[PDB]
Amino acid sequence: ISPIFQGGSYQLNNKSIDISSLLLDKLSGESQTVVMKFKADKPNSLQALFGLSNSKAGFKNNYFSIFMRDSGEIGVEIRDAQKGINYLFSRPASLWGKHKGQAVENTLVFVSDSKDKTYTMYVNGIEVFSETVDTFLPISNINGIDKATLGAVNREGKEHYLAKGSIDEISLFNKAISDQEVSTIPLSNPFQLIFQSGDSTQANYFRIPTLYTLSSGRVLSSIDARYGGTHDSKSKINIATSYSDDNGKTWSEPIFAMKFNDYEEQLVYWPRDNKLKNSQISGSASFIDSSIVEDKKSGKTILLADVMPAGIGNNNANKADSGFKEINGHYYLKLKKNGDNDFRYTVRENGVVYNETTNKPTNYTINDKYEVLEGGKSLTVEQYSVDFDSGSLRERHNGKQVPMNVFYKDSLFKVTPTNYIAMTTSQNRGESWEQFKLLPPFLGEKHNGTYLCPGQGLALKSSNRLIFATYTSGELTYLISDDSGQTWKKSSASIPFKNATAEAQMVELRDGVIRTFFRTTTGKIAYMTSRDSGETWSKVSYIDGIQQTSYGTQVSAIKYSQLIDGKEAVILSTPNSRSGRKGGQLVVGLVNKEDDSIDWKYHYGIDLPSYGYAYSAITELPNHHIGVLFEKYDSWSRNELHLSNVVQYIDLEINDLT
């Protein structure tokens, strides 16, 4: 249909614009759609973009409004005091502010559907909320509405929620347009999605992005596909990957690099209310935090990630047990059988399950997918699905048999409830991935696995050496391979933090010289240096000029291939804020060849200081542009859990940053 009202280029400069005469008598029927293209690069703390209100004395709570916050949150209020209705629907982190120094044109579509009794909000082509109510309130049915307002709500004759911004285009329709019709509305997005709700992963949530440019020019990305809301393990999470062959312009449909099937892949709208938001899938195995590297010698791509057995996460993992038994300098995975109170089994050569009490081999073997075979025959377990139909989280058997895996809750043989690191490889640059293999323990029998630093591993330019940083209590533990990832050794580097989440990323400043940048608990990003390709490490220094919170955030880093201002350059990506995970920046540092010190010379604001920015991935694209895949929300805030389509990708050029 055609709009009943259409207007444009309204400047909102802390003074509302009255459009009552143009709009109010056009509103008819109980369903409406508002389409608005707007900019707000310097918003007030809380401002209304659009309002329909009863402006009369005594009716201050009779209004509809579309509002936004300087946090990037978008929402509506639908209120009628006579009807006893006060609806407020919103979602944090729904907006863009600025991109490449220019105000972003956000495209907002709000659908008020009387038939389905549903209110649905889209911003920039992303559905941010859809709420059904028992008692529907049509937005123009509010008792005594007499004002239509841009840039404020008129309450009792005064301007409330005054806005700063502009509305370049606004249209209203006397219909609830369909999801299909919404998808046809042209967008002006500064970003694209690689992974997204409804894609092949069927996860409604994503966290922990990575990016890595392969030698063929293919750009590869990995991610946590998170099913049970955005929660860290324990949960259900798989590792997914996608690649681009055209410098990031388009991306392949995701495939899995690492997946478990003890629970169904379900796209679930996780509750965001205070009473249920901490609901957590508690019986599923999961993977979490992935990292990628390419090996020049073999041509293989190698991906590592943490692995968690059913119901296990950082919080409850046995810190005092590697999950392996040492027997003659060799490490074997320990297993517990149904009914036993200790772990009386190990997995030996060729997957043979072996009885430790009586030194007997059994009739069980573990295959290459960590699945249990009895006499060569595949054992199975029944899969679980989750639902909130009862008003709380239920996890229950769904009738489907899947291969019995030692990481599962229902398995005959179970691994130690602690965290591990696994690796997988691809021989076709991410078109398919092999079955994963567990890495051995590096810090002894009675120490849980170290935690993988998400992002990139490091392929040294002048050798075959591959390094993946990991962290644990009191140190960074670098994992080093010189044989294409077939065998690994550790190199430990003490850090002056006990129990830090010391997520670390590396750059090779020059041949054999590695600087590692890492998250701390001090509000400053730290660094250390190796001058012997990772064999030994310097003391820890701190970067001045960037602020993080007390708890810190992952930082990503690359060595740029081109000189900047005549100097070698490193680029860091991180939030810059002492308050929360917001104020994302790319910071360009120029290397001083005298001493390898770095002058952090340029700070590029990814979006507003108040808009969300958490974990991130950066890569130099083959055309020398910079690709950034990042969590565009505060992934620490307990108010911003369970948001969809906030991991987003942008393309930048060096001239944008400087």
From Swiss-Prot:
Question: Which amino acid positions bind substrate, per UniProt?
Answer: R207, R519, R581
What are the GO cellular component annotations?
Answer: cytoplasm; intracellular membrane-bounded organelle; membrane
Annotated TM spans: none
Q: Which reaction does it catalyse?
A: Hydrolysis of alpha-(2->3)-, alpha-(2->6)-, alpha-(2->8)- glycosidic linkages of terminal sialic acid residues in oligosaccharides, glycoproteins, glycolipids, colominic acid and synthetic substrates
E.C. no: 3.2.1.18
Active-site residues are: D232, E503, Y615
Gene Ontology molecular function, alphabetical: exo-alpha-sialidase activity
Any one biological process term the GO annotation gives: oligosaccharide catabolic process
Looking up InterPro entries in the UniProt record yields: BNR_rpt (IPR002860), ConA-like_dom_sf (IPR013320), Glyco_hydro_33_N (IPR004124), Sialidase (IPR011040), Sialidase_fam (IPR026856), Sialidase_sf (IPR036278), Trans_sialidase_dom3 (IPR023364)
Q: Does the keyword Transferase apply?
A: no
According to the record, where are the BNR repeats? 242-253, 424-435, 479-490, 528-539
Keyword list (alphabetical) reads:
Glycosidase, Hydrolase, Repeat, Signal
The record ties this protein, via Pfam families, to: BNR, BNR_2, Sialidase
Family stated for the protein in its record: Belongs to the glycosyl hydrolase 33 family.
Q: Extract the PANTHER family matched here.
A: EXO-ALPHA-SIALIDASE, SIALIDASE
Spell out the protein name for this chain.
Sialidase B
Q: List the source organism.
A: Streptococcus pneumoniae serotype 4 (strain ATCC BAA-334 / TIGR4)
Gene name as annotated: nanB
